[PDB]
Amino acid sequence: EYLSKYAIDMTEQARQGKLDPVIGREEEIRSTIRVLARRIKSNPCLIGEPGIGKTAIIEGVAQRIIDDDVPTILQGAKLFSLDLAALTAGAKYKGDFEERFKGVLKEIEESKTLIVLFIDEIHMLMGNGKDDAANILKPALSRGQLKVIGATTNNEYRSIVEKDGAFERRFQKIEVAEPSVRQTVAILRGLQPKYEIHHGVRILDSALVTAAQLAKRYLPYRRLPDSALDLVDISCAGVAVARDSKQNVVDSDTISETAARLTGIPVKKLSESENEKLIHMERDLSSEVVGQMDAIKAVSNAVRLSRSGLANPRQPASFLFLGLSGSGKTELAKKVAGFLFNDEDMMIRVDCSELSEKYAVSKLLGTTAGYVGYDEGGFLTNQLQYKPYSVLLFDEVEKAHPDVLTVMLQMLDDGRITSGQGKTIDCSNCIVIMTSNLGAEFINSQQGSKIQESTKNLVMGAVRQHFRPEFLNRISSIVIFNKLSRKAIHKIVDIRLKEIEERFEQNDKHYKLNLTQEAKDFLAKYGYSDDMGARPLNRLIQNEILNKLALRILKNEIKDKETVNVVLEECLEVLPNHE
Amino acid sequence: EYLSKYAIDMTEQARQGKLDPVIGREEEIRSTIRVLARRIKSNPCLIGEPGIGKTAIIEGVAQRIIDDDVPTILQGAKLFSLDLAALTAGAKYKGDFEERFKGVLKEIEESKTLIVLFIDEIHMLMGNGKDDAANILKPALSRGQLKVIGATTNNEYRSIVEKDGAFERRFQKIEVAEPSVRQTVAILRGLQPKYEIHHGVRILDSALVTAAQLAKRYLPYRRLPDSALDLVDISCAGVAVARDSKQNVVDSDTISETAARLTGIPVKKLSESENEKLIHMERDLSSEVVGQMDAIKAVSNAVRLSRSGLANPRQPASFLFLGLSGSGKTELAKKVAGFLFNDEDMMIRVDCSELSEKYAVSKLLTNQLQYKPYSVLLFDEVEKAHPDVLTVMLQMLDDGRITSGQGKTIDCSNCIVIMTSNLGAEFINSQQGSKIQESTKNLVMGAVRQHFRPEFLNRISSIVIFNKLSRKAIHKIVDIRLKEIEERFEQNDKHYKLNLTQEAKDFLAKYGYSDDMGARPLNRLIQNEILNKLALRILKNEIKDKETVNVVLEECLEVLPNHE
Amino acid sequence: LDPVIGREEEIRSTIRVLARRIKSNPCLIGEPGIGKTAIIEGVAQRIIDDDVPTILQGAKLFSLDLAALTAGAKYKGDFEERFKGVLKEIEESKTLIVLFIDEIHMLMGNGKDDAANILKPALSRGQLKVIGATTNNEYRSIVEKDGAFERRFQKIEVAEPSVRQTVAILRGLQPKYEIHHG
Ligand SMILES: Nc1ncnc2c1ncn2[C@@H]1O[C@H](COP(=O)(O)OP(=O)(O)OP(O)(O)=S)[C@@H](O)[C@H]1O
Ligand SMILES: Nc1ncnc2c1ncn2[C@@H]1O[C@H](COP(=O)(O)OP(=O)(O)OP(O)(O)=S)[C@@H](O)[C@H]1O
Ligand SMILES: Nc1ncnc2c1ncn2[C@@H]1O[C@H](COP(=O)(O)OP(=O)(O)OP(O)(O)=S)[C@@H](O)[C@H]1O
Ligand SMILES: Nc1ncnc2c1ncn2[C@@H]1O[C@H](COP(=O)(O)OP(=O)(O)OP(O)(O)=S)[C@@H](O)[C@H]1O
Ligand SMILES: Nc1ncnc2c1ncn2[C@@H]1O[C@H](COP(=O)(O)OP(=O)(O)OP(O)(O)=S)[C@@H](O)[C@H]1O
C-alpha cells in the first residue's frame, strides 16, 4: 500500500468534499481527460508557472470522476497525487528510492482499477541522464496503463525534453495560462463561501476585487490566483482574529492592511484616484523638493494622461529633465519615483557617458549569447525585468552614441524593449526620465531663480540643435529645471539636518545644534551654488559635524543634546567637560 | 494515550505559570495565530537564527491560548509540543518510533480539543524521511488535521522547501526578529533571580545590561537571547567559581572581563586610550604605514564614525582601496587590524580575483566570520569578481548582512570591510607630484564607476585613494624595513647594526625607491645589495654575529673577524 | 599524564562550563595537535592538586572506550545494555563523576541508529557531565549528524599556542624527554 504513504487520494478527497471548487479551467479539465481517455501514452502534462491553479485542474478532474462526467474507461479511475519529495527525502542507500517508487508503480499495475497519478513536478525525474532516475515512469508509461498526469514549470519542461527525448515521446503537453485579474476575481468569487464558512466572516464582493488588483500590482512574484487568495484568506483571518480577540472583511481596510503587511507598504492615503489625479504628487513633491515646483506640474500633466487610460497603453510617460546642474536632478527623479510608484527604490540609474559606438547598446541591454558575459541587461533590462514600475533615469544622455538613443526612443514608442538575449521585457508601465545639463550654461547666467525666456530658448535651443528632433517629439514633455533661491538652500539644509536626527537611529543621541542662523549660514553659504547642489552641504555635515562629533564622542566631549561650534570654520562644542 | 508520554501541554504549562512572559514578542505571535486561522498555508513556521527565542515564542503562544486570545476557528485549541526525543530515543528497532509517532498523531487528531502541535526540529522531515517525510505532516494535513507550528533556522527551512515544495503550500514562513537590547535586558531581568538561584550570585542590573551590549558587540552572527544569556550565566558561574575557590555579585565589569577571557578579545576594555588612539589614528597610522595621510584619514574617519555610532547605522566601516603596487594598500589593511583589534591577523582574506558564482558561493560564503567577527575583511581584486560576489557584497555592506552557509546571516556591522581594486590606477598612475591631484582624482572616480555601480559606491564608507608614496615617506619606510630585517632573523645569531644608517637610507631612497613602485624597491634593494652579500659572507664564515653594514659607491657590508 | 603547561584559561573555562547551567557540558574543539587532550589531562591534575572549585573537588574523571559498545554486539541490543550500564554507573552516587570522550564524533554512530541512547537522556537532564573533545572539522560533522549535541554541549574553541608558549610547554616537558632518552 505504498500509495497510502506517498500519495494523496485526490479522488476520495473529492468525494468527501475536501477539494476547492474549480473555476475557469473547464477546457484544461477537458483536455486532461481527453488525453487520459487515449489508449496509448495517455499521459498529459500541466505545463506552466507554480501558483496558477494547476492543482485546481487536477482537483477539477477528480470531481469529474466523482460525478461520473468522465469517459467510460476513466469512470472507475482513482487519482493519486504522488509526492516525489517524500519518496526521495532521506533515501541515502543505493536502491532505497528505487524500491519505493517501483513500489507505487506495482500497486498501480496490480489490478486495482485504473489508477492515474498526478506528479508533483515531472521534470524532477530527469535524473543524471536517467540512470539515477532509473525506470521511474519510464517504458511502462508508454503502454502498460500507468497513466500519468504530469506537471511542470515550462522552463523545466523544456529541459526535460531536450535532455531526454523519450520523455517527449511519452507525454502530451497541456499548457496552462495564469488567470487575468478579472478571472482571478471570478475564482475568488467561486471560493468566497468557502472562506466565509471557514473564517466565520462576511466577505465583500468588492474585497475580492481589490485583492486581485493589489495582487497584481504589489505582489508580482506570485501568480494572481495565488496572491489574491492569500490576500483574501489573510484578511479574513485578520478579521476573525481581531474580532474574536475582544465580520466585515472590508474591501478597502482589511485588504489594504493585509497588503501593507505583505508588501512593506503603509496603508497610505494613496487611493488610486489620488494617484490618478496626482494631487499629492504636487503637494508632497512641493514639500520634498525645492525651486520652481511648476516643473512638477509639467511632469504631472504627462503622467495624468497615462493614468486616465487615454494614452496609448504602449507608450510609457516620459520627459526630458533639462536644466541646471545642482538642481536636485536625481533628487527629484527619486522623489517622483517615490510618490508616483510609491517607492524611491523604483529608480534605476543609467550612465550614458559610457556609450561608445562599438559597445554602447550592449552595455545597456547586455551582450548576446556567446560574447563576454551573459549578465544580460547590463543596466536596463536587468532591472526592468523585476521592477515594471521603475523609473529609468539616464545621466548625460547628450553624450550617448545615437544608436543608444535610437534604442531608447524605440523603447518609448510601442515601448517594448528586448535584452541582448532576446528577452522581451516591456516598459509600458515605466516612467522614463532622460536628463541633461546641456543648457545649464545659460541658466548659469543667474537671471533670477526662474528661468526667463531669454535663457529658456538657449537651454532648449541647444537641446533642439543637439538631438535629432524625433528625440524630443517622442518624449511626452521637456521640463525645464530652475535655479534655487537662498531660501531653497535653507530648506534643504533643514531637511538634511532632520535626516541626521533620523540617521541617529540610536535616538538617545541627537542635535539641538544651536547656531541655527550662523552654522546654518556657514553651511548654506558653502553650498549655495548652481555647480554644487547639496554636494558640499553633505560633505560639511559628514565632516565638520559628524567626523568632528566622532572625535568628541570618543573623547567624551559630547554625549547628547549636541551643539555646533562655528568660527567664521566648523566643529562641535564641548558639552561634558572632557569626561 | 501515547500523547500522555509524548505530548507536552504547553497551554496547561502556561495556565499553571510554568512558562515565562516574553518581551512584547506578542506582535509576532499574533501573526502565528493569523496563520493558524487560515484555510490555505495554515501551518506557520518560526524561522530565524540561533538565539531566535523560538521556545519563548511558543511559551508566549501558550499564554495566549490560556487567555484564549484566538479566533473562533482556533478558539479553545490547545498547544502540545512533541517529545521528539523520547519518541525516537526509545527506538529499540526499526518501526518503534514510527508507530509511536503515528500513534501520537492519531490520538492528537481526535477528541482532545482542537490541537495544534509544536514541532521543533521541523527539518526532521528531511531526516526521518522516507515514509515519515509524509507521515509526519502530509496525510494529517490532507484531512485538515494536525495544524502545527513548526520551527527551525533559516538554513534548514531553506533546505526543506528547496527539497520539498509541499512546504510552500502547507507552511507560512514566519521570520523572527532579533530583540532590542532593551528587550534583551528585560529577558535578563526576568531571568535575573533564576541566575541568582542557579549560581548563588546576585546579578547587578547594569551587568544584565552590559551582557546585552557585549554580546551584540562581539557576536554579530548570534542572536541576543542566546549570547546575552550566556554572558550572564558564564559570569555568574565565574563568580560562583571564584567564590567556591575563595558580595557574591556579578558586576558589569565582571561580565566584561568574562567576555575578554571568553573570546580573547577585550570587547569592553574601552580604556580612554582606546578612544584616544582613534582620535590619533591618523597620527599613529602614519608611523605604521608611512604617510599616506589622506588614506589613513579616510580610514580613521570611517572607523571613528563607526566606533562612535555616527556612521549610518547600516554602514559597517568599509573601504574600496585604489592605488599602485607598493602603496601600502595591503599594509594599511593589516595595520588597521593591528591598531584596532590589537592584532594584524584580525583580517579575513577573500580571493575575489578568482571568483565565479558556481564556486564563489562556497569559496567566499564561509565561517571565517564566526571566528573573527571584528576582522578586517580583505577582498582582493573585487573589480574582477563575479557579479554574485559583488551582489553578496551589497548585502554585506548593508549592515554586515553577509549570507553564509545555507542561508545564515552574519550581520557584522562591527567588522571592517576592505576591498581592493586597481581600476583607479588608470589615473592614479598620473603621478602628479605626490598627493593625488585635481583632475586626476575626478578621473579616478570616473574609472571607479566603470565597474562599481552606485550600489557599491554609495554604501562603502569611503573609496580610498593612496598617494604616490613620496620620498618623504621613503625615508621613514626605510627605518621600518631596516627594523623588520632584524625582526626577521629568527636565528638569533644574525644580529646586525647599520653604519651610516642614513646613507643606507639615502641609497635605499635614491637607488632603490622607484617613483612608480612605491616601497617595493626598498625591499628589493636591501636584498639586492645587503642580504645577498651577507649570505655569501655567512657561508664563507666571515660573519658570525653583531655584524655591521657600511656604504660605498654600492652598499658595503663589513667584515667581522673570522666567524666564531 | 604529562603536566599540562600554559593552558590556564582553557582549564578555567572548561571547569567554568561545568559550573554553568546552560549548555553546562563542554567540548574542546580545534585543530588536531594543539593539546586538547592535554587540557583535559590538565583538568585531572588540577582536581588532584585541589586547585579546583568545590563543585568538582574530589571528582573522578574517566575516559570512555569504544568498547563500551564495541565489546561486541553478539546479542542485538547489547550495545545499549553496556552503554546504559555505564551511564548509570557514572551518575550513580559516587561523588561527581566526569566523563571524558576523546573524539566525540564516534558517538554519532553510523548516522544515529547505533548511536542509540548515547548521552541522549543524559544530556536531556543535565546529568553525567561530559568533557569531550574533537577536531573542528568533526565538530561540524557532529552538528550535521546529531544536531542535539550542538544544542547540549558547549563549544570551546582551543587555539594553537604561540611559539613562546610552545617553548614553555617544551620546557615543562623537557625532563620527561631527558629522562626517557638519557
Ligand atoms: N482556478 C482555481 N480554482 C480553484 N482553486 C484555485 C484556483 N486557483 C487557485 N486556487 C487555489 O489557490 C491555489 C493555487 O495553487 P496551485 O497553483 O495549484 O498550486 P500548485 O498548482 O501546486 O503550484 P505549486 O507548485 O504547489 S505553488 C490552490 O492551492 C487552490 O487552493
Ligand atoms: N531642487 C532641489 N530639491 C531638493 N534637493 C536638492 C535640490 N537641489 C539640490 N538638492 C540636494 O542636492 C543633492 C542631490 O544632487 P543630485 O541631483 O544627485 O546632483 P545634481 O544636483 O543633479 O547636480 P550634480 O550633477 O550632482 S552638481 C541632494 O543631497 C539634495 O538634497
Ligand atoms: N525573549 C524572551 N523572553 C523570555 N524568555 C526567553 C526569551 N528568549 C529566550 N528565553 C528563554 O531562553 C530559552 C529560549 O531558547 P530557545 O528558543 O529554545 O533557543 P533558540 O532561541 O531556539 O536557539 P536555537 O535556534 O534552538 S540554537 C527559553 O528557555 C526561554 O525561557
Ligand atoms: N606606506 C607604507 N609604509 C610602509 N611600508 C610600505 C608602505 N607601502 C608599501 N610598503 C611596503 O610594500 C610592501 C607590499 O606592498 P602592498 O601594499 O602589498 O602592495 P599593494 O600596494 O598592496 O599592491 P597589492 O595590490 O596588494 S600586490 C609591503 O610589504 C611593505 O614593505
Ligand atoms: N600545553 C601542553 N602541556 C603539556 N603537554 C602538551 C601540551 N600541548 C600538547 N602536549 C602534548 O602534545 C600532545 C598533544 O596531544 P593532544 O592534546 O591529544 O593532541 P590533541 O590536541 O588532542 O589532538 P588529538 O585529537 O589528541 S591527535 C600530547 O601528547 C600532549 O602530551
Curated annotation (Swiss-Prot), chain C:
Result for mutant: residue 103 to Q: In HSP104(TRAP); completely abolishes ATP hydrolysis, but does not affect nucleotide binding, thus keeping HSP104 in an ATP-bound state
GO cellular component: cytoplasm; cytosol; nuclear periphery; nucleus; TRC complex
Stated consequence of mutating residue 75 to A: Reduces thermotolerance 10-fold
Alphabetical UniProt keywords: Acetylation, ATP-binding, Chaperone, Coiled coil, Cytoplasm, Isopeptide bond, Nucleotide-binding, Nucleus, Phosphoprotein, Repeat, Stress response, Ubl conjugation
Effect of residue 2 to K/W/Y: Impairs prion propagation
Keyword Aminoacyl-tRNA synthetase belongs to the record: no
Modified-residue entries (Phosphoserine), positions: 24, 124
Phenotypic consequence of residue 133 to T: Reduces ATP hydrolysis by 98%
Subunit structure: Homohexamer, forming a ring with a central pore. The hexamer is stabilized by high protein concentrations and by ADP or ATP. Oligomerization influences ATP hydrolysis activity at NBD2. Interacts with YDJ1. Interacts (via C-terminal DDLD tetrapeptide) with CNS1, CPR7 and STI1 (via TPR repeats); under respiratory growth conditions.
Family: Belongs to the ClpA/ClpB family.
Record protein name field: Heat shock protein 104
Gene: HSP104
